[PDB]
Design an enzyme around this catalytic site. Sequence first.
Site, short mmCIF file in Angstrom:
data_model
loop_
_atom_site.label_atom_id
_atom_site.label_comp_id
_atom_site.label_asym_id
_atom_site.label_seq_id
_atom_site.Cartn_x
_atom_site.Cartn_y
_atom_site.Cartn_z
N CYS A 54 -6.24 -28.57 5.19
CA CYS A 54 -4.97 -28.07 5.70
C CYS A 54 -4.31 -29.07 6.64
CB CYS A 54 -5.15 -26.70 6.35
SG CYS A 54 -5.52 -26.72 8.12
N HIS A 80 -4.44 -22.66 9.75
CA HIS A 80 -5.74 -23.11 9.27
C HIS A 80 -6.50 -21.96 8.60
CE1 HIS A 80 -9.82 -24.51 9.01
NE2 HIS A 80 -10.14 -23.38 9.63
N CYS A 131 -11.89 -29.09 5.53
CA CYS A 131 -10.62 -28.43 5.26
C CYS A 131 -9.50 -29.44 5.04
CB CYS A 131 -10.26 -27.55 6.45
SG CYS A 131 -8.72 -26.62 6.24
N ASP A 163 0.83 -1.20 0.00
CA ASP A 163 0.00 0.00 0.00
C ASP A 163 0.87 1.26 0.00
OD1 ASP A 163 -2.38 1.43 -0.09
OD2 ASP A 163 -2.94 1.03 2.00
N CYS A 175 -5.92 -29.51 10.13
CA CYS A 175 -7.15 -30.29 10.19
C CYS A 175 -6.91 -31.76 9.88
CB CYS A 175 -8.20 -29.69 9.25
SG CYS A 175 -8.78 -28.08 9.84
N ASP A 210 -7.58 -8.07 0.22
CA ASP A 210 -6.71 -8.18 1.39
C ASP A 210 -7.53 -7.89 2.65
OD1 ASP A 210 -5.81 -5.57 3.01
OD2 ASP A 210 -6.52 -4.87 1.05
C1 LIG Z 1 -9.73 -2.13 6.78
N1 LIG Z 1 -10.34 -1.27 5.78
C2 LIG Z 1 -9.63 -0.61 4.84
N2 LIG Z 1 -10.23 0.19 3.94
C3 LIG Z 1 -9.23 0.72 3.15
C4 LIG Z 1 -9.23 1.68 2.15
C5 LIG Z 1 -8.00 2.08 1.64
C6 LIG Z 1 -7.95 3.19 0.69
O1 LIG Z 1 -8.94 3.82 0.32
N3 LIG Z 1 -6.69 3.52 0.26
C7 LIG Z 1 -5.55 2.87 0.63
N4 LIG Z 1 -4.42 3.24 0.04
N5 LIG Z 1 -5.55 1.87 1.52
C8 LIG Z 1 -6.80 1.49 2.06
C9 LIG Z 1 -6.78 0.53 3.09
C10 LIG Z 1 -5.48 -0.04 3.65
C11 LIG Z 1 -5.07 -1.38 3.05
C12 LIG Z 1 -3.77 -1.87 3.66
O2 LIG Z 1 -4.01 -2.16 5.05
C13 LIG Z 1 -2.90 -2.94 5.45
O3 LIG Z 1 -3.19 -3.68 6.59
C14 LIG Z 1 -3.19 -2.90 7.79
C15 LIG Z 1 -2.63 -3.90 4.28
O4 LIG Z 1 -1.23 -4.06 4.11
C16 LIG Z 1 -0.61 -4.87 5.10
C17 LIG Z 1 -3.22 -3.17 3.07
O5 LIG Z 1 -2.23 -2.84 2.10
C18 LIG Z 1 -2.14 -3.71 0.99
C19 LIG Z 1 -8.02 0.17 3.64
N6 LIG Z 1 -8.32 -0.67 4.71
ZN LIG Z 2 -7.84 -26.57 8.38
#
Ligand SMILES: CNc1nc2cc3c(=O)[nH]c(N)nc3c(CC[C@H]3O[C@@H](OC)[C@H](OC)[C@@H]3OC)c2[nH]1
Ligand SMILES: [Zn+2]
Lengths: 360, 360
Positions: free
Chosen positions: A297, A326, A295, A79, A300, A257
């Site tokens: 994995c 898991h 599952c 990100d 399991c 993600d």
């Molecule tokens: C939980 N809700 C949620 N809504 C989101 C919306 C956005 C957004 O509009 N712009 C950007 N740039 N990032 C967002 C993110 C963060 C994703 C990252 O959060 C990171 O985890 C903490 C993860 O990377 C380990 C991931 O990066 C790939 C969001 N997270």
């Molecule tokens: Zn499992």
Amino acid sequence: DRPRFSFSIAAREGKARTGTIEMKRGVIRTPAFMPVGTAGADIILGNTYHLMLRPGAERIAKLGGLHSFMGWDRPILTDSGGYQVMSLSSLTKQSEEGVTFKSHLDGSRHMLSPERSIEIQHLLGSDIVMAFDECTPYPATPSRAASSMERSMRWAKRSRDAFDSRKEQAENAALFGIQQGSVFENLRQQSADALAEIGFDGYAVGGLAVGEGQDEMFRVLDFSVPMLPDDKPHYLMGVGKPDDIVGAVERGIDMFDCVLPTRSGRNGQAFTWDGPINIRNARFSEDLKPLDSECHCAVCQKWSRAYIHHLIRAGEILGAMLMTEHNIAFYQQLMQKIRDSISEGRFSQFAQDFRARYFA
Amino acid sequence: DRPRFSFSIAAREGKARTGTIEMKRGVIRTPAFMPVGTAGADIILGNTYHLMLRPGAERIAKLGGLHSFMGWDRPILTDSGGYQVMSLSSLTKQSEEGVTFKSHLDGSRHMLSPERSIEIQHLLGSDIVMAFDECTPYPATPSRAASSMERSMRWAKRSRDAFDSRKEQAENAALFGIQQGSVFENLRQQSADALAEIGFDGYAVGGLAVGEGQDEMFRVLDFSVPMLPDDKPHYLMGVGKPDDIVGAVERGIDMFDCVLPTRSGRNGQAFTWDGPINIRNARFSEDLKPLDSECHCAVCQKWSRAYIHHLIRAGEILGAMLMTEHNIAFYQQLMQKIRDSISEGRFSQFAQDFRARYFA
Ligand SMILES: CNc1nc2cc3c(=O)[nH]c(N)nc3c(CC[C@H]3O[C@@H](OC)[C@H](OC)[C@@H]3OC)c2[nH]1
Ligand SMILES: [Zn+2]
Ligand SMILES: CNc1nc2cc3c(=O)[nH]c(N)nc3c(CC[C@H]3O[C@@H](OC)[C@H](OC)[C@@H]3OC)c2[nH]1
Ligand SMILES: [Zn+2]
């Protein structure tokens, strides 16, 4: 030799798609779940915000880049860092240039701008680089959502230009633009149009999973995803629970993600086809069944709910590791079943069967 | 088919021995390190005291016994439970019958006696059962050490009789007696004589690793181990650090257990041939070498000190799991090198080389 980036759709059902992204370091099967790298998956996440603060992007580059550092030679997505800055940092200062903030770890000053975010991601060596955007808070008024989205689109162009200026990055990585606009159809359209005019390798739906809830998230996806280029991958950031993933795939999302598998795995929650279970609860103390009945994995295949319950209750790290293994595997089995059902023309039935069982 | 119990010495050097214990569930190569089961090894430990309190021995038996519960079909050793009762329990009450105590988890009353300890170990299904003894506190006066040891020897006979009364246990498990006597040669001799008169499958040296320090522990081992039957295995309870293991093998010990590999693995300490290292220290933040330069474990084949440092500093469970996997593997490589060096007649040189490098 694989190309820098090539997305191909192999089959479709409704708005759902299944296919592959080819990159130099590997093929990514879509729809894809992308787990945290520090937790099989075709791509993992690097935590840009954490890595910026410890040990720092320059130091990661000195150590050979993330792939070497993590011992992972396949694709990595990072990100752009602002989401976490606004979520976790203190005394932030925002301007058209970017955001400045103080590190909670040691008080050092840090700035993030489109240019610096792209450079950080370059130093980390990631394969999929996110544009530097502003994730608008929810709820937002139309005026504030518009002003925020407009700034993000100016920052998207700056991100594009910074990425293109770095030959190694331009030739070997890919850049995704991030749609904003809160819950407003006209702003989502303006944002999609601005991103497509700049041109990106993939398109993320930003600004969701920020407190709006599933009904509203799905309502926004219903009109927002069709606005993005059909022939490019669609990444819904921050999503989500298994039922969120299924419904987002039904609405045209290709990549996901979320912190749930690992957060749940460290907090006693196991995902199963019959919904999440709280393994610490006494009801599992004598349950000889595996975490999930179907599952495949390794956990399991070998161990019972009763034993995993015992380990977690005893404070043994082995318990959390088994839960996380898991949960990761469950998520990848979910994505495999999604891909196969779309490819076989039975995803609609899969989604119906999934929901009837997950929520029984 | 393997016998219930058969110990055979294949080679000797000084007081050191190497060989095998054959039991129905497997062969145990000696000298052996026996890791906690909830952490390759030929035998693992079950934590009798914890299991008594959660979920209880009867419940473990209902679930099929430890082997089924833990998913481990090879030998398991259990302690008799009193050491931990006296170490961890509250408001204990001691008598010639046994000890009564209150569970810290839920206040329930529990008693332990030779008969109940053997029955608990039967219900758990362990393969090597320890006699119920009193680990005399250190320091102890001669009078108190004598009175304590005499009670332990009466309890050793009660343990023998309880074990022999349970056909399944007598036919399929083995029983070790535990020598007491604190640091006093005459009491150690009386204890050895009493145990040999009763007759056990193996003999443990109890009452050490309780604060006396290595010089005194080795001094006591120098006269205590020769008092035990030569043709039976010798188990030093609670030991220890790698240098304690090497010196105890030099004094005739065949079996070891200790909390160090797992406690260290959860607290940032990695064992190496050049001594323990504190991986959280900043000096490892850019160290691209594996945890140990010669280790063959999967962690050292793939990841650097720098990455493990990063994970532990970030609070990631993956870091502690990698440290523990490495530490377990280090201990088993230590034991393999010990066994091979005795078998090859070069253990004296191994011990000298080990100490010069471990303490450099
Ligand atoms: C939980 N809700 C949620 N809504 C989101 C919306 C956005 C957004 O509009 N712009 C950007 N740039 N990032 C967002 C993110 C963060 C994703 C990252 O959060 C990171 O985890 C903490 C993860 O990377 C380990 C991931 O990066 C790939 C969001 N997270
Ligand atoms: Zn499992
Ligand atoms: C640390 N020093 C140390 N000196 C000891 C001396 C004795 C002794 O004289 N009698 C008995 N019966 N047990 C002893 C014990 C406990 C070993 C158990 O301690 C358990 O770990 C906590 C482990 O089982 C998971 C093991 O059981 C196989 C000792 N521990
Ligand atoms: Zn190693």
